[PDB]
Amino acid sequence: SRYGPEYKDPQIDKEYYRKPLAEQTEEEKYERDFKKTQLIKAAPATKTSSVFEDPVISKFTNMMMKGGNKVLARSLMTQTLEAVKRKQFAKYHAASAEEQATIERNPYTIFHQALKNCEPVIGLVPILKGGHFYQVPVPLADRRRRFLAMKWMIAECREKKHRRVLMPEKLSQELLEAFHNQGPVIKRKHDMHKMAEANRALAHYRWW
Amino acid sequence: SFFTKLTADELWKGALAESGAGARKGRGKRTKKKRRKDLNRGQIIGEGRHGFLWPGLNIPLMRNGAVQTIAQRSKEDQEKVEADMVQQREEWDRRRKMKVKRERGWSGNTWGGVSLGPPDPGPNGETYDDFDTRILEVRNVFNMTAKEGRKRSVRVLVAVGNGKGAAGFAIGKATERADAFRKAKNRAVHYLHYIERYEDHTIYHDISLKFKRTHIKMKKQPRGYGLHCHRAIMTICRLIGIKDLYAKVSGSVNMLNLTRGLFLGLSRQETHQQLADKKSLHVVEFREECGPLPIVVASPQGALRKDPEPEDEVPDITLDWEDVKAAQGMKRSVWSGLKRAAT
């Protein structure tokens, strides 16, 4: 809020500005954008025009960061991606042509898929009624769910590793185990789902 | 220790303690009083008790056409000067301890009956020195405020009149007593009634009115019988110019309802001329001291009737058991005959 409410967020996408001539409503729209004499917030240091940056990877990076260390958290992320990569290159050359067609070597797609699998469907909110606190099944927003996934990943691979064991190691492990749905993270997701079925009657207490 | 000292204003402000929290909620009594005396009041520039005389200050700059030198008074001369100053202080203490007399209205601590003196000139330059004002009721009144808790306003009820038949009353209310006085004066002059006076001493005819819960009952007297009335009514009458009257108030004696009720009543008087005109007859007055001789008071401007009034053998009128009891000598109260001071 060193920006007045007048200031719009910038659009960093290069593809949007490069190829305008085929869209009428969007031409009209960004015409109205700049021509409105509209002020623009200065593009943040984290975000780049880079063809290489995944906003999800960056979010995760941030949620991993303790104190002020981007350098250290970006290190750990980088190392983890490299570790998943090399773990799958190991699993590729000791395999046979069929499994060489099957196995995924893109660490990015592995990260994404492993998060999609770990995100909860349904959730729980405490509701006070008649002086008692019941836990009630609540549908969740998308953002809340992605958040729950990432936070659960990091909480586990911070908490449950042996102190000798480094972070990118444990994290690459859990990424690959959650890729295949057998990870402890996924067990947590299921504990939620089961607690949500156990209480399904109480779904009536929710007024919204 | 010279730096350690202060201004007089600071020191007095300090000592008086008018701004404390004691004064606000009335957390201390009104019989406790202390005052501020100027300590520069009697002092002159140059004066000191060492006794010096400075050419520009104590003494004139030139004596006999020359320049006076710096000099000092004799011991006994300074003795006399200090004697003078001490006697000056004692004189100011003699002036301060004398309290001016307050003319007492009804009672010593009542404000009722007291004169405020003429109301203030109106914006047009219009001036009433002919009007007097009397206070009828002053009252401390309260309201419960969100912040301050109890909040004390004075409200006074006042009446003005010139003695010549125009009087009126009004009420005024303010935090300060002085302020409410002003307000109620200046406001009173705006509601004036004209009171018709028979022969300029009494009212015209007997009046009985019930205003809210107050009953006033007035009777019209002859020339000598001065002002026998509730004390408020006497006050108001003296302001109107009504010199001879009898009025008994019953029911609630509440002051505002009394003066409203009274003015309503007096306003509604029906003059002899008005009566003459509505009946279209001569109205003829029989004095007892003048015998059978028929004084003609009012005559009906316009055409007089040739028709006599229907003679009612026995009238149907509302009678007050009080007046009947009075007429037949059944009022034995020890409070009624009492000799009182003059009007």
């Binding site: 623009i40 593009a43 025009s49 | -």
Partner: protein, 328 residues
């Protein structure tokens, strides 16, 4: 208060003569602009509030406008609306409504004669036309107004302009016009520069958060960047900062085509990267097309980042963080 104004003008003129004399200038060519410099030099008050500093000005500007006398010496009020308590405003309303009726009549006669000869003058939008503020109107009638008052009046002018506009009508509603000044956010292009037989170099200066950066870019060179006399891979060890430096070039696809020298001071590493980022962006605007400039602005490349460290506050810990609060 009229004698006052007269006198004040007399003495302002006498005074302006005197002042012009001591300052040693021609009394005729003396302006308000000159009066000001003269006082500022004679009575030099540093005080931050400009209204509290010494002023000698024409009494009409100094004193507030006065309601003139409202009635003759006999007591009869001059203006027929006097007793309304607002004559000025209700007159305006009266004449406005009058002109509305007039318009309606005339245009109805022209409806019966088969003539619509007028046009809609109601679009002045390219002139950047707006209505007066309430403050302005209040100054034009020399009278206080109410919000609902102003509202009423404006609504009425709207009713007026929404009909066929007469000449005297157009002129009438146009007292109540103002024009909003220039609205364009287009930047000011740095003129490209040719130096010592070298062609096409441009300059730019970024500032971010205690870091200042001056960047000179050569269009004629290959891709490399020299920051404070060393290579940009050496000066910016962190990937993130190199990506920051990369952002504007990669955005314009100039990534191989330009050769830059930089001077950056103060702040930390990330702040310097940010500074050079902004400066580079501002320097590359000379080489590019006017449209891509708008694009860089819309990517937030050309705006300084206002976010700066807040001052710690006494009785707190961190400029926001509070000392621990004990309930009981």
């Amino acid at each position: 208060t009229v004698d006052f104004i007269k006198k004040q003008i007399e003495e302002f003129n006498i005074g302006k003569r005197h002042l012009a004399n001591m300052m040693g200038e021609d009394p005729e060519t003396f302006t308000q602009e000159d009066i000001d410099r003269a006082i500022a030099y004679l009575f030099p008050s540093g005080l931050f509030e400009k209204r509290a500093r010494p002023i000698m000005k024409h009494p009409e500007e100094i004193f507030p406008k006065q309601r003139a006398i409202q009635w003759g010496e006999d007591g009869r009020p001059f203006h027929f609306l006097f007793y309304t308590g607002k004559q000025s405003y209700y007159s305006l309303m009266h004449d406005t409504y009058g002109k509305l009726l007039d318009v309606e009549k005339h245009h109805n006669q022209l409806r019966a004669k088969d003539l619509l000869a007028e046009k809609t003058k109601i679009l002045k939008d390219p002139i950047g036309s707006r209505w007066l503020i309430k403050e302005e109107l209040e100054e034009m009638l020399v009278e206080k107004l109410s919000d609902q008052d102003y509202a009423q009046f404006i609504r009425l002018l709207e009713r007026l302009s929404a009909l066929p506009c007469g000449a005297t009508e157009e002129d009438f509603v146009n007292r109540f016009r103002r024009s909003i000044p220039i609205q364009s956010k287009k930047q000011l292009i740095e003129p490209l520069q040719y130096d010592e037989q070298g062609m096409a170099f441009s300059r730019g200066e970024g500032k971010r958060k205690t870091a200042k950066a001056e960047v000179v870019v050569y269009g004629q060179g290959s891709g490399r960047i020299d920051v404070n006399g060393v290579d940009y891979l050496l000066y910016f060890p962190v990937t993130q900062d190199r990506e920051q430096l990369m952002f504007p070039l990669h955005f314009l696809d100039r990534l191989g085509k330009h050769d830059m020298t930089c001077a950056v001071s103060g702040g930390g590493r990330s702040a310097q990267a940010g500074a050079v980022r902004l400066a580079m962006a501002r320097a590359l605007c000379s080489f590019v097309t006017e449209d891509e400039v708008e694009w860089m602005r819309q990517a937030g490349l050309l705006t300084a980042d206002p976010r700066v460290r807040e001052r710690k506050k006494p009785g707190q810990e961190g400029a926001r963080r509070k000392f621990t609060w004990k309930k009981r």
